[PDB]
Paper text:
[name] encoded multifunctional protein [name] plays a key role in promoting viral mRNA accumulation and translation. Previous biochemical studies showed that [name] is stabilized by dimerization, which is critical for its function. [name] comprises of two domains with distinct putative structures: the highly disordered N-terminal domain (NTD) from residue 1 to 166, and the helix-rich C-terminal domain (CTD) from residue 167 to 455. Each monomer contains a zinc ion chelated by four residues, the cysteines at the position 333, 427, 432, and the histidine at 423, which form a consensus zinc-binding motif.
Two kinds of [name] crystals obtained in our experiments were used to collect X-ray diffraction data separately. The spindle-shaped crystal crystallized in the reservoir contains 0.8 M Li2SO4, 0.1 M BIS-TRIS propane and other crystallized conditions shown in Table 1. After data calculation, the cubic crystal consists only of monomers in the crystal asymmetric unit, while in the spindle shape crystal [name]-CTD forms a dimer in the crystal asymmetric unit and the resolution was relatively lower. The dimeric crystal belongs to space group P6422 and the final structure was refined at resolution of 3.5 Å with R and Rfree values to 25.9% and 30.6%, respectively. Moreover, in the dimeric structure, only residues V168-L175 and S455 are unidentified because of the poor densities. The two monomers in the dimeric structure are nearly identical, and the root-mean-square deviation (RMSD) of atomic positions is only 0.528 Å when superimposed, but the N-terminus of the monomeric [name]-CTD in dimer extends out to a different direction from the N-terminus of monomer if superimposed. The dimeric structure is formed by the extended N-terminal “arm” region contacting with the globular domain of the neighboring monomer and shaping as a coffee bean conformation with approximate dimensions of 69.0 × 50.9 × 50.0 Å in the asymmetric unit, with a deep groove extends around the interface of the two globular domains. The N-terminal “arm” region of one monomer protrudes out on the globular domain of another anti-parallel monomer, while the C-terminal end is enclosed into the globular domain of the same monomer. The arm extends from the globular domain of the same monomer to dock in a canyon on the surface of the globular domain of the neighboring monomer like a barb. Thus, the arm region in the dimeric structure lacks two unstable small η-helixes. PDBePISA analysis by comparing with other interactions at the dimer interface showed that the “arm” region makes major contributions, mainly (>75%) by its hydrophobic residues, suggesting the “arm” region very likely participating the dimerization.
Author numbering:
A (entry chain B), B (entry chain A): 175 to 454
The structure:
Amino acid sequence: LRLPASMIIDGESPRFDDSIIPRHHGACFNVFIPAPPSHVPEVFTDRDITALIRAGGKDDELINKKISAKKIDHLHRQMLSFVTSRHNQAYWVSCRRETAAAGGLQTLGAFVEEQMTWAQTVVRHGGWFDEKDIDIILDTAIFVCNAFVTRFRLLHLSCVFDKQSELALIKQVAYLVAMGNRLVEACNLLGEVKLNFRGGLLLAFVLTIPGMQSRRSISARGQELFRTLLEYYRPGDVMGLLNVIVMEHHSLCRNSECAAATRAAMGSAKFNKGLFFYPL
Amino acid sequence: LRLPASMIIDGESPRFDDSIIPRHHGACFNVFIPAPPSHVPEVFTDRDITALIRAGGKDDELINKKISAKKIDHLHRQMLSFVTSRHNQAYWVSCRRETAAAGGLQTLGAFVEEQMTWAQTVVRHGGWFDEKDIDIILDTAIFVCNAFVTRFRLLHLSCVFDKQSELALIKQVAYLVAMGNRLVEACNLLGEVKLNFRGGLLLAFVLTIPGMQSRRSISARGQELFRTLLEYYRPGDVMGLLNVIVMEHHSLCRNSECAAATRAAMGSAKFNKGLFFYPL
Ligand SMILES: [Zn+2]
Ligand SMILES: [Zn+2]
């Protein structure tokens, strides 16, 4: 009965419940969800990302989505076209959004790798994020970040980070992002902090792109941080950090629910729709 | 800004650091998670819960896993001799844990329907929520409930639920369940308020089993609420409410992002391993 703002609470309780449940529609094996943007103008782009876009529609192993960054800054010539193509826009965003929601940290990590590598390329070849220019990868970047942090909290963090205050910051940042409403305070708290440790740097790596997309309502130190992070970023980093963190702790901690919560928190990597490229 | 507990702020602003990142392992495609529980001893069961079990090893469509409440009422002492088997425990709990952990609201709704129907049955034959007496479906009940609500938080609830009071309840209850282990506070809150709307009744339906497993720590209203909710529930209620909220909303809310979040959060129902039965 610590209730801000409600009006009618029960005075008995009576209590009853039957009327509102639709018991007459019978079984329901599928929920009547709105239609997807299945409509694809089916634009054929050139000259040979055909297999790369078809890979952006499959769920192969990550081992089948490799590109060395040499190719990325090379084929950027019209990869920027495909991503900014006014055709097929909300479709890929929807596809990539529906997978980012669910789930498994391995998948979301690879997504961050791709979106970090892409953004580092599109600032290398000139051009910062307008307010706001249309672009598939960066438009889903915020969805990737939130879903990453949220599926991240399902780790036994009290066990993985056997550190005093590191765990405190990580817990608060993961909290701030997980409530959705408060990102500017999550990504600006990251900034006036030490980042010697791994886990906080891993979160800062994730909040790079969305920290940049919001670089107007944030602190002064934040912009310096995320621009530095994107500048000195390299591919395979986020997966490296995440991997070595889980590797070492579970090389030691042979608990039960810790190994379980970890095993659950990162599902298989097979699920990729719609992942275009895994950078290396 | 305000930082309660920390040891070293930064005035200096050092960089980067690059040594903390293990840049020498190279390429990572599968994170090195601990081993999965070993299945394949199997229990030599027998007509005909094998067919039921085998449905727990496959990602079939919901309709292919259907069952009638009259059947699982008949098939009880048999089915109970499996879910309470000495062997193959943490395996099936892991399968269910990881699936609900990734899966979307449709998958989790099926799990909820199953576990509620199962608890109804084992109660109907004198059983009770022992702690612990090893019931696969009731162990996973916490993970299902949590993950359901954590993903329920993806919908544009400000657009799905009109009156600010019902919405406010849904938002706070979701905040408690999803964020932290403040579960008992949530069950108390559901216990206070009259549930004559589909949002609160749906969530309360989800939390019945974890509430009934926390019967000692929960307020009087909570104990009576979840007792009655467990007795008067009849299969389909959860999906029926979930569906009918979506259906009746998006039949007049053609908002691009509201339907986008709804599509992303629901997710396909083909993923359900291991879902033993979908009750009717
Ligand atoms: Zn551990
Ligand atoms: Zn709406």
